[PDB]
Amino acid sequence: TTPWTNPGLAENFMNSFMQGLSSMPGFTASQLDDMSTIAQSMVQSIQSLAAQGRTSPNKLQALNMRFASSMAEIAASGSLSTKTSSIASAMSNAFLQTTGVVNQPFINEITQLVSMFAQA
Ligand SMILES: [Br-]
Ligand SMILES: [Br-]
């Protein structure tokens, strides 16, 4: 479904995503640090919603939009496409490490949203 549905998977997935991304092209070392902050913010938002018994698919979706727009600010600052494709690759690898099943629609949606927010 979405790695955000379970607060524990959310954190494991995000950690693997950031671990993977650190070896990929497109981002400077300082941009990777900014991505990490964005990634922590997202995990924390998911976890806080869940802890308070306030989560819902629609709140999780809006957080995903905020997450992509935040990434896009960095991705838009190698090129946008090198960064976007690296995000997709690190996410794919993170799925394999965590769920063992790649959620390609999620990956594609993220790349789509990051590209969309960037061109604004
Ligand atoms: Br890794
Ligand atoms: Br409870």
JSON list of N, CA and C and ligand atoms in Angstrom, two decimals, residues 15-23 93 97, ligand 1:
[
{"chain": "A", "resi": 15, "resn": "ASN", "atom": "N", "xyz": [14.95, 5.27, 6.70]},
{"chain": "A", "resi": 15, "resn": "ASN", "atom": "CA", "xyz": [16.35, 5.13, 7.04]},
{"chain": "A", "resi": 15, "resn": "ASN", "atom": "C", "xyz": [17.13, 4.44, 5.93]},
{"chain": "A", "resi": 16, "resn": "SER", "atom": "N", "xyz": [16.54, 3.42, 5.34]},
{"chain": "A", "resi": 16, "resn": "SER", "atom": "CA", "xyz": [17.18, 2.70, 4.24]},
{"chain": "A", "resi": 16, "resn": "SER", "atom": "C", "xyz": [17.25, 3.57, 3.00]},
{"chain": "A", "resi": 17, "resn": "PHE", "atom": "N", "xyz": [16.21, 4.37, 2.80]},
{"chain": "A", "resi": 17, "resn": "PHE", "atom": "CA", "xyz": [16.17, 5.32, 1.68]},
{"chain": "A", "resi": 17, "resn": "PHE", "atom": "C", "xyz": [17.33, 6.29, 1.81]},
{"chain": "A", "resi": 18, "resn": "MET", "atom": "N", "xyz": [17.51, 6.86, 3.00]},
{"chain": "A", "resi": 18, "resn": "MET", "atom": "CA", "xyz": [18.60, 7.83, 3.17]},
{"chain": "A", "resi": 18, "resn": "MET", "atom": "C", "xyz": [19.96, 7.15, 3.10]},
{"chain": "A", "resi": 19, "resn": "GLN", "atom": "N", "xyz": [20.08, 5.96, 3.67]},
{"chain": "A", "resi": 19, "resn": "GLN", "atom": "CA", "xyz": [21.33, 5.21, 3.59]},
{"chain": "A", "resi": 19, "resn": "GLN", "atom": "C", "xyz": [21.73, 4.98, 2.14]},
{"chain": "A", "resi": 20, "resn": "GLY", "atom": "N", "xyz": [20.76, 4.58, 1.33]},
{"chain": "A", "resi": 20, "resn": "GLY", "atom": "CA", "xyz": [21.00, 4.29, -0.06]},
{"chain": "A", "resi": 20, "resn": "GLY", "atom": "C", "xyz": [21.33, 5.53, -0.85]},
{"chain": "A", "resi": 21, "resn": "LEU", "atom": "N", "xyz": [20.61, 6.60, -0.57]},
{"chain": "A", "resi": 21, "resn": "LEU", "atom": "CA", "xyz": [20.75, 7.82, -1.33]},
{"chain": "A", "resi": 21, "resn": "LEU", "atom": "C", "xyz": [22.15, 8.41, -1.16]},
{"chain": "A", "resi": 22, "resn": "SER", "atom": "N", "xyz": [22.78, 8.14, -0.03]},
{"chain": "A", "resi": 22, "resn": "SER", "atom": "CA", "xyz": [24.07, 8.76, 0.25]},
{"chain": "A", "resi": 22, "resn": "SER", "atom": "C", "xyz": [25.18, 8.30, -0.72]},
{"chain": "A", "resi": 23, "resn": "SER", "atom": "N", "xyz": [24.97, 7.20, -1.43]},
{"chain": "A", "resi": 23, "resn": "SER", "atom": "CA", "xyz": [25.94, 6.68, -2.39]},
{"chain": "A", "resi": 23, "resn": "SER", "atom": "C", "xyz": [25.56, 7.03, -3.83]},
{"chain": "A", "resi": 93, "resn": "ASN", "atom": "N", "xyz": [15.40, 0.39, -3.69]},
{"chain": "A", "resi": 93, "resn": "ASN", "atom": "CA", "xyz": [16.28, -0.42, -2.88]},
{"chain": "A", "resi": 93, "resn": "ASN", "atom": "C", "xyz": [15.78, -0.51, -1.44]},
{"chain": "A", "resi": 97, "resn": "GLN", "atom": "N", "xyz": [14.87, -3.85, 0.91]},
{"chain": "A", "resi": 97, "resn": "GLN", "atom": "CA", "xyz": [15.51, -4.07, 2.19]},
{"chain": "A", "resi": 97, "resn": "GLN", "atom": "C", "xyz": [14.48, -4.25, 3.30]},
{"chain": "B", "resi": 1, "resn": "BR", "atom": "BR", "xyz": [22.27, 0.93, 1.52]}
]
